Amino acid sequence: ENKVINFKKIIDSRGSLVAIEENKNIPFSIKRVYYIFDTKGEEPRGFNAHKKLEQVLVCLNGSCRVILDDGNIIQEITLDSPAVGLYVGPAVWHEMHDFSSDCVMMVLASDYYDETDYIRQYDNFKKYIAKINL
């Protein structure tokens, strides 16, 4: 798989614009939108996977280093353009690293926040996969 989504960009004298439509340029319906900013420290994040949740990650400013693990393949990608999406399907583990100081990271979700949809142990993540594989 290739989980990158290159969004259609509009350009003019004024700037750039990108539009994201649920079930249009993204495979799911948007129920939530969240973002990280004014970041500090050197601790990364993510380190989990969901069971039902489908999301798309967008680095609206600065850049961030993201790693994805479908259980089969691990893909490291550096997000440094707002016209690039990252699709994090269900059962896909993820981590965000190297956040720029000026970074703004945005996530689009298929569902509302649910602490219970978070698999926080890689090992378990892996286990879960197998079972799926079965």
Q: What is the DSSP string of 64-85?
A: EEEEEE-SS-EEEEEE--TTEE
| Residue 17 binds ligand TYD (CB under 6 A) | yes
Rule CB under 8 A: which of 36-95 touch a copy of itself? Answer: 36-41, 43, 45, 60-61, 82
Q: How far is C-alpha 2 from the chain's CA centre? A: 13
Residue 15, by phi and psi: left (phi above 0), alpha (psi -120 to 50) or beta? Answer: left
129, two tokens: 């996969």
AA identity, residue 117: D
Question: Residue 58: which of 93, 88, 101 has the closest Cα?
Answer: 88
Choose between 10 and 132: whose C-beta lies nearer to ligand TYD: 10
Choose between 46 and 62: whose C-beta lies nearer to ligand TYD: 46
Choose between 33 and 74: whose C-beta lies nearer to ligand TYD: 33
| Residue 10 binds ligand TYD (CB under 6 A) | yes
Binding site for ligand TYD (CB under 6 A): 10, 17, 19, 32, 34, 45, 113
Positions touching a copy of itself (CB under 8 A) are: 13-22, 24, 30-41, 43, 45, 60-61, 82, 99, 102, 104, 106, 108, 112-113
